[PDB]
Amino acid sequence: PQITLWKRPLVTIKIGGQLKEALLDTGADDTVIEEMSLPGRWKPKMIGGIGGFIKVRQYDQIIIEICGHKAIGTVLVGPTPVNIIGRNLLTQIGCTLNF
Amino acid sequence: PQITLWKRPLVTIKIGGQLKEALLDTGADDTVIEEMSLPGRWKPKMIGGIGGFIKVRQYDQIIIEICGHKAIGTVLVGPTPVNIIGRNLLTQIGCTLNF
Ligand SMILES: C[C@@H]1CNC[C@H](CCc2c(F)cccc2NC(=O)CC(c2ccc(F)cc2)c2ccc(F)cc2)N1S(=O)(=O)c1ccccc1
Ligand SMILES: [Cl-]
Ligand SMILES: [Cl-]
Numbered sequence: 001p002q003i004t005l006w007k008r009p010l011v012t013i014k015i016g017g018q019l020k021e022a023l024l025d026t027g028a029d030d031t032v033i034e035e036m037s038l039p040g041r042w043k044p045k046m047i048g049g050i051g052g053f054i055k056v057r058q059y060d061q062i063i064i065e066i067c068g069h070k071a072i073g074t075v076l077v078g079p080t081p082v083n084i085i086g087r088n089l090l091t092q093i094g095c096t097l098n099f
Numbered sequence: 100p101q102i103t104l105w106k107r108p109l110v111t112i113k114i115g116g117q118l119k120e121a122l123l124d125t126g127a128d129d130t131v132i133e134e135m136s137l138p139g140r141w142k143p144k145m146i147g148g149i150g151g152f153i154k155v156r157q158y159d160q161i162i163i164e165i166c167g168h169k170a171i172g173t174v175l176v177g178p179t180p181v182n183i184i185g186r187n188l189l190t191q192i193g194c195t196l197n198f
């Protein structure tokens with residue numbers, strides 16, 4: 001698909017058997033999801049930007065379905081104000097910026 | 100151009116006759132740049148990020164060139180970690196997300 005930027009680019013995702021709404025964010029290096037359980041090992045990480053930093057749990061090799069496109073990668077879980085699909089997963093679905 | 104997301108989508112911008120590097124960010128509603136002098140009056144604005152909210156200065160109708168494309172619009176100035184081109188100006192240059 002082609003997504004315009006008149007509004008926030010929010011899409012439905014499937015992660016850990018749950019349907020969630022997430023923002024396609026080219027400015028984010030990593031994917032960050034609101035608090036939820038994920039299987040496997042995790043390690044702590046700090047991520048930051050506008051407003052400062054937050055502590056998150058880093059889970060590796062997590063499958064996410066974004067607009068019917070399957071992608072696998074690291075998913076950070078923590079107190080984010082919005083679910084964010086960052087570059088680590090946008091590349092896997094072949095997402096590009098065009099102008 | 101078509102920009103992939105394996106690396107940060109950094110481009111050259113021109114504002115106030117100066118070249119600067121900026122990140123194309125579909126996850127940002129607005130454009131925020133690091134401290135610099137801009138003309139005219141400014142209005143107060145709060146922007147929310149991963150770590151919480153910050154106060155910035157809102158300047159309107161600012162001329163800015165983004166990867167050679169001319170835009171004229173709102174530019175926020177504040178303690179942002181990097182210069183960010185948000186949706187308000189990405190729409191002006193006709194930027195879309197494609198997959
Ligand atoms: C979700 C929004 C919108 N995308 C941008 C940003 C990403 C934050 C983020 C995630 F969400 C998830 C995972 C990682 C990160 N951080 C980075 O990737 C670091 C990165 C960065 C930091 C702060 C920034 F402002 C913008 C980019 C960085 C780039 C170059 C450097 F040299 C150093 C750092 N957030 S924001 O701060 O809250 C916000 C920015 C503007 C307006 C509203 C909100
Ligand atoms: Cl990854
Ligand atoms: Cl590619």
Ligand SMILES: [Cl-]
Nearest residue numbers: 172173187188
């Ligand atoms: Cl604007």
